[PDB]
Each structure stands twice: as C-alpha cells, then as structure tokens.
Amino acid sequence: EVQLVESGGGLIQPGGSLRLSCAASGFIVSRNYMIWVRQAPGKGLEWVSVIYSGGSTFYADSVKGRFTISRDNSKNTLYLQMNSLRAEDTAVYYCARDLEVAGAIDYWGQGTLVTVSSASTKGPSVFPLAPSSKSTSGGTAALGCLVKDYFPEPVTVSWNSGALTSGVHTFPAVLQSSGLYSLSSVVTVPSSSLGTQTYICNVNHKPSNTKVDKKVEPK
Amino acid sequence: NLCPFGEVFNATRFASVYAWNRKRISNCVADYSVLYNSASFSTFKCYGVSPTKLNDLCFTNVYADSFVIRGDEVRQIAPGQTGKIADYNYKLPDDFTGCVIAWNSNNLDSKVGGNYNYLYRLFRKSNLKPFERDISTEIYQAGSTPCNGVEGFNCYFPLQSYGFQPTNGVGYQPYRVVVLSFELLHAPATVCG
Amino acid sequence: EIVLTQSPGTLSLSPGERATLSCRASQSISSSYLAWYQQKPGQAPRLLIYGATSRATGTPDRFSGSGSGTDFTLTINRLEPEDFAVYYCQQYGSSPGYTFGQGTKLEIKRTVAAPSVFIFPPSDEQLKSGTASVVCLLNNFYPREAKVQWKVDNALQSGNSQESVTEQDSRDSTYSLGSTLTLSKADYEKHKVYACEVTHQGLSSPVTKSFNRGE
Ligand SMILES: *[C@@H]1O[C@H](CO)[C@@H](O)[C@H](O)[C@H]1NC(C)=O
Numbered sequence: 001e002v003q004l005v006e007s008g009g010g011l012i013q014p015g016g017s018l019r020l021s022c023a024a025s026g027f028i029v030s031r032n033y034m035i036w037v038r039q040a041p042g043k044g045l046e047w048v049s050v051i052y053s054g055g056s057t058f059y060a061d062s063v064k065g066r067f068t069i070s071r072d073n074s075k076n077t078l079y080l081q082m083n084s085l086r087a088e089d090t091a092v093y094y095c096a097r098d099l100e101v102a103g104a105i106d107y108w109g110q111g112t113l114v115t116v117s118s119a120s121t122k123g124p125s126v127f128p129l130a131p132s133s134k135s136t137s138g139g140t141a142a143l144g145c146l147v148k149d150y151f152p153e154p155v156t157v158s159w160n161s162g163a164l165t166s167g168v169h170t171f172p173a174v175l176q177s178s179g180l181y182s183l184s185s186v187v188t189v190p191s192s193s194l195g196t197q198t199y200i201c202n203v204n205h206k207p208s209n210t211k212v213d214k215k216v217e218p219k
Numbered sequence: 220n221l222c223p224f225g226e227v228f229n230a231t232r233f234a235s236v237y238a239w240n241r242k243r244i245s246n247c248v249a250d251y252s253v254l255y256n257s258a259s260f261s262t263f264k265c266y267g268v269s270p271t272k273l274n275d276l277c278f279t280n281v282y283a284d285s286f287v288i289r290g291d292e293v294r295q296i297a298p299g300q301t302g303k304i305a306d307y308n309y310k311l312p313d314d315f316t317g318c319v320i321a322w323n324s325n326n327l328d329s330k331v332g333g334n335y336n337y338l339y340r341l342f343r344k345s346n347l348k349p350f351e352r353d354i355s356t357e358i359y360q361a362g363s364t365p366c367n368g369v370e371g372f373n374c375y376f377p378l379q380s381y382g383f384q385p386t387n388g389v390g391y392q393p394y395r396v397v398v399l400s401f402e403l404l405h406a407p408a409t410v411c412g
Numbered sequence: 413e414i415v416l417t418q419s420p421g422t423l424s425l426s427p428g429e430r431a432t433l434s435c436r437a438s439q440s441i442s443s444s445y446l447a448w449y450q451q452k453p454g455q456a457p458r459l460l461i462y463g464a465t466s467r468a469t470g471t472p473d474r475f476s477g478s479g480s481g482t483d484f485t486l487t488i489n490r491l492e493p494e495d496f497a498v499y500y501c502q503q504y505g506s507s508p509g510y511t512f513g514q515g516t517k518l519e520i521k522r523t524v525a526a527p528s529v530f531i532f533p534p535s536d537e538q539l540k541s542g543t544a545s546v547v548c549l550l551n552n553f554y555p556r557e558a559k560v561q562w563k564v565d566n567a568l569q570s571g572n573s574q575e576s577v578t579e580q581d582s583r584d585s586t587y588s589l590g591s592t593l594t595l596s597k598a599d600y601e602k603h604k605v606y607a608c609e610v611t612h613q614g615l616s617s618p619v620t621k622s623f624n625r626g627e
Contacts, residue, residue: 002362002373026362027373031344035510045449045457045500047510054346056301060508094456097361100303100341100504101379104447106468108456129532129547132623142530142549146592148538169551169588171576176594183576184590186549188528291506372469380444386481388440390506 002026009112011152022078022095030073033098038091085116115152123208124150128216135194144186145201157185158202222247227283236286236308237340244281245409262321277408284398291390307340312349317400328393335380342377414506418513426521431488435501440481445505450497453579493585522585526614527553531621544600546593548608552586559611560591565603
C-alpha cells in the first residue's frame with residue numbers, strides 16, 4: 001500500500017530543535033518532488049520546503065536558514081530538521097508528494113503537531129460525566145468523560161476500546177485561563193442500556209505518560 | 220568568413236530546452252558588439268569575458284546553444300543556479316566563460332488556445348552535468364512498481380508541455396535563449412572578431 | 413509575490429444545490445499551474461483538481477474546475493452532507509513555487525433540529541481536588557447558533573464558563589456544544605440550584621436543565 005507516515009512532532013521550547021520524519025511506502029522518496037506544508041491552528045496551508053529527486057532544496061522565506069529538508073534513501077524516509085523554533089512555528093506539519101503539472105500534490109501524510117512553548121508538560125485528570133437518566137425512562141441518556149488540566153495537546157479518547165463510536169462527540173480542547181487545556185468526550189445511548197452495558201472512556205496523553213481507562217457508571 | 224549568427228538568432232523555430240540545439244561556429248570573423256548593440260534583448264549577461272573585449276579575442280571554437288523557456292526560468296540559465304531547468308534540462312558550469320542572451324518571443328511562440336509544442340523535462344533521477352543533453356522519453360518510475368513502458372500511477376511521461384498562450388503573464392510567456400560559450404584549447408584559433 | 417484570494421470566505425448551502433467557489437490570482441498564471449483541495453476536519457487536504465480542470469484520482473464528475481489567467485472557479489454540483497469542508501486553491505507556477513488561497517469554508521444546511529440538553533454535576537472525585545466543573549451538553553442541533561445561560565440560585569453567571577463546539581457532522585449535518593461552568597469547591601457549596609438554560613431556533617421557548625447540589 002502507498003502511504004506517508006509522519007512522526008516527531010511534539011512540545012519544544014522556543015529556540016529548540018525538532019526533527020520530523022516522513023516514512024514512505026511505495027513512493028521512492030529519492031525519486032520524487034517531496035514537500036512539507038504546515039497549518040497553524042485555525043489557519044490556512046503554508047508551504048515550507050521542497051526537495052528534488054536530484055537533490056536541490058528550496059524553502060519559504062519564513063523558515064529559510066532555520067529549517068533543513070533531507071532524506072535517507074535506505075530508510076525511504078523524508079526529514080525536516082527545524083532549529084531555532086519560534087511560537088509562530090506551532091502547526092500541524094504535513095509531508096506530501098508533488099507532481100507539479102503532472103498532478104499537483106496528490107498524496108499527503110496524516111500530519112504531526114508541533115507545539116513551541118515553554119509551558120511545562122502536565123497530565124490530565126479524568127472525571128466521569130455520569131448519566132442522570134434512569135434506565136427506565138424509555139429515552140436517551142448522555143454520559144461522558146471530562147479530561148481536565150493538561151498540556152500540551154493532544155489527548156486521544158476512545159470508548160470501550162474503540163467498539164463504541166456511534167453517538168460519540170469528543171469536543172475540541174479549550175485553553176483555560178491557567179494555560180492548561182480541558183476537553184469533554186460524550187456519548188448518547190439508550191437509557192435502557194445503562195443496566196446491561198459497561199461504558200469506559202480510554203484516555204491517552206502521551207507527553208505525560210498518562211493512559212487512563214475510566215468506567216462511567218450511573219448514579 | 221563572417222560568422223552565421225543570424226542563422227542562430229533568427230531561426231524560424233527554436234528547440235525545446237530538453238533537446239537544446241548546439242551550433243558550432245568556426246572559420247569566421249565574429250564581432251559581438253554588433254550583436255550586443257541591439258535594444259532587441261531583455262537579457263545579455265556575460266561571464267568571465269566582457270562583451271566589448273570579445274572583438275579582441277581568438278577562440279578555437281564557439282558554440283551557440285539555443286532553446287525556448289518561460290520568462291521566469293531565464294534566471295536559471297546562469298552559473299551556479301538550481302531549479303527544474305538548470306537541474307534537468309540545460310546546465311551551465313560553475314566556471315562558465317560566455318554570454319547568455321534572451322528575448323521575449325511571445326509574438327512567435329504563443330498561440331490562442333496554447334502552443335504545446337515546447338516541452339521541458341519535469342522528471343529525472345539526477346542532475347544534468349554541464350552541457351549535458353538528455354533526450355530520452357522513457358516512462359519515469361516514481362514508485363516501486365516497474366512501468367513496463369506504460370504510463371499510469373507512479374509511471375509518468377518525463378516531458379511536459381509549456382502552455383504558451385498570448386495573454387499569459389510575462390513570467391509564463393516564451394523566451395528564446397542563446398548561450399554563447401568560448402572554447403580555447405591549444406590548436407588553431409578559427410573564430411576572431 | 414503572487415496572492416490567491418478566495419471568495420466567499422464562508423458558504424452555506426442545502427443538499428442538491430450547487431456551490432461556486434472563486435479563486436482570484438494577483439497576477440495572471442497559466443491554468444496548468446492551479447489546483448483545488450478539500451480539507452475535512454482532522455484530515456490532510458485531499459486533491460480535487462489539478463491543472464485548473466483535470467480531475468484527480470477519486471474525484472467524481474460533480475466536482476468541476478474552470479478558469480484561466482487571474483480567475484479560477486471550483487463548482488460542486490449535487491451537494492451532500494459529506495461536502496462540509498474547507499476548500500483551498502493553490503498555484504505552483506510562480507515564486508516561491510507553492511502558494512495557497514485562504515480557503516472557503518462550506519457548511520451544508522439541513523432542516524432545523526433542536527438540541528437535546530443534558531446537565532452533569534461535578535464528580536465527587538473532582539470535588540476532592542478542590543474544584544467543581546459543571547457541564548451542559550447541547551447535542552445534535554442545527555443551525556449552529558445557540559445560547560447557553562448558566563444560572564446558580566437564579567443568578568445569571570458571566571465570566572466563569574467556557575464553550576466548545578464540534579465541527580459539523582459529515583453524516584447528519586448537526587453540531588454539538590458543551591459549556592463548562594468552573595467554580596471552587598467552596599463556592600460550589602454555597603449554592604443549591606445549578607441550571608443551564610438553552611435558547612435555539614428549534615425550541616419554541618428556552619429549555620432549562622437543572623440539579624440541586626447534593627441531591
Ligand atoms: C536578425 O534579423 C534582423 C532582421 O531585421 C537583423 O536586423 C539582425 O541583424 C539579424 N540578426 C543577426 C544577423 O544576428
């Protein structure tokens with residue numbers, strides 16, 4: 001299968017350095033035009049860098065002299081070395097294969113989030129949002145998990161290890177006035193299921209080594 | 220006895236840059252100030268040689284290479300440049316001794332609906348060496364799967380068309396280019412001014 | 413250098429209608445060097461069109477590109493809920509080699525749908541930490557405009573709540589919203605009735621969910 005898998009994004013202090021990786025399958029990185037494009041939170045797309053099959057490289061003015069694109073043919077991997085990082089470099093970074101007039105940018109990696117900040121890492125607290133409704137109402141119950149006070153983004157939430165996806169809403173994180181994020185994840189289910197089915201939110205915050213499975217039970 | 224520069228500069232048709240043309244100039248008297256002095260040129264950059272100087276020298280051969288590229292690409296026809304044209308189509312050496320001359324040819328090489336006869340090489344594994352000319356049309360394998368001479372996903376024809384239409388912006392308009400390079404080995408000097 | 417200006421900035425249309433998205437370039441480019449992308453939330457951009465008119469792999473015929481010079485258009489026929497996205501244009505012929513428009517955000521309309529409203533008291537676990545978060549959930553409504561009024565013993569609360577809204581659902585075209593009221597434990601214990609009052613076009617009068625602390 002043909003794809004581009006990115007890694008390396010995460011929290012870095014201003015002035016620091018990070019290397020992003022883009023592992024390709026199928027495409028031969030060294031035979032293609034390969035690019036990096038970034039997207040700051042809520043903003044549009046910004047082209048960052050390109051490397052040619054013959055080895056020529058080019059850079060946007062906003063990163064020139066600080067970023068270096070490169071590749072390793074033996075690992076079929078594209079890299080972006082970012083130095084002297086600044087707050088405005090905070091973005092989701094995409095690698096992609098470019099075909100210019102033969103097809104523009106037809107394949108993109110999934111993105112890796114880079115956060116440039118001096119705030120400390122902190123793991124979330126996970127609290128239940130317990131269903132109020134009685135199992136006998138004949139209607140719909142809502143339940144969830146409050147994932148509170150964490151830094152940096154992102155966290156992931158699943159329900160019943162990924163078996164429950166219908167009716168799930170995981171909300172965008174909000175930055176609180178403390179500088180820590182918070183988010184809720186909720187699911188709606190038949191009230192009659194509260195007595196027969198167990199509901200567990202699985203929360204992972206990798207930067208803080210926090211992996212929590214919380215059972216949400218009626219009260 | 221007079222060098223046939225008009226043959227080169229006034230040719231009805233010019234080559235695509237990937238298949239650039241080379242004219243060998245020998246056993247003639249040149250005179251490039253008559254060539255230079257000509258408001259008829261948007262680019263006339265000389266490297267090493269000065270122009271009013273060339274009337275004085277004697278080289279054992281002179282090459283006139285010529286082709287068409289986009290206005291935005293003329294800057295790549297210089298020592299030490301990189302980009303699709305310099306890397307994969309026409310490459311000057313770092314120590315180039317010669318002159319690059321170019322003029323806008325929109326009134327000759329553009330057509331309503333696009334003239335698609337001029338091509339450039341888009342895909343190539345490696346950079347050209349200086350004065351290397353690659354006219355292969357093998358399907359370019361961009362992935363792991365062999366193309367077996369058939370175009371498809373990850374199997375691209377290596378040459379692509381410029382689309383020269385008259386109302387294009389100037390950077391997208393055709394420019395005719397002539398590169399003069401001056402050859403001094405150790406033998407007869409057959410081209411003087 | 414070249415700027416691509418897309419319009420309208422935002423667009424909201426019903427299923428079965430046709431969206432017309434414009435991309436204007438600050439200088440004339442050859443149409444061989446313009447492309448369109450669709451970006452749904454959480455995903456990388458997806459190529460729709462390249463060379464102004466050529467459909468990429470997987471792009472159905474209801475997506476059509478046109479234009480030349482300084483003016484390009486993407487047309488989306490037979491709109492459906494899954495067409496909710498941000499659409500970007502892109503040039504790749506002029507300096508510095510890649511430039512994107514700022515995007516048109518497309519919303520897909522549906523029949524009005526009132527939120528289902530739920531309120532959640534703080535957990536005993538959280539109270540043990542010294543803080544109380546009270547959560548009001550507005551589930552699966554349309555349109556996006558909705559008002560959440562927190563009341564604590566009937567005093568309207570301002571300055572101590574934060575909202576988050578989901579992106580439009582790709583299947584049912586609804587939004588959901590959560591509002592969190594944050595108090596210290598000591599403040600939370602000074603009051604009885606916690607209520608969130610919800611206003612929305614689909615509700616003939618505001619809906620209030622409430623609880624009594626400790627009940
Ligand atoms: C090309 O043709 C024009 C015709 O007016 C002529 O003036 C010019 O000298 C020619 N270029 C040469 C001879 O290099």
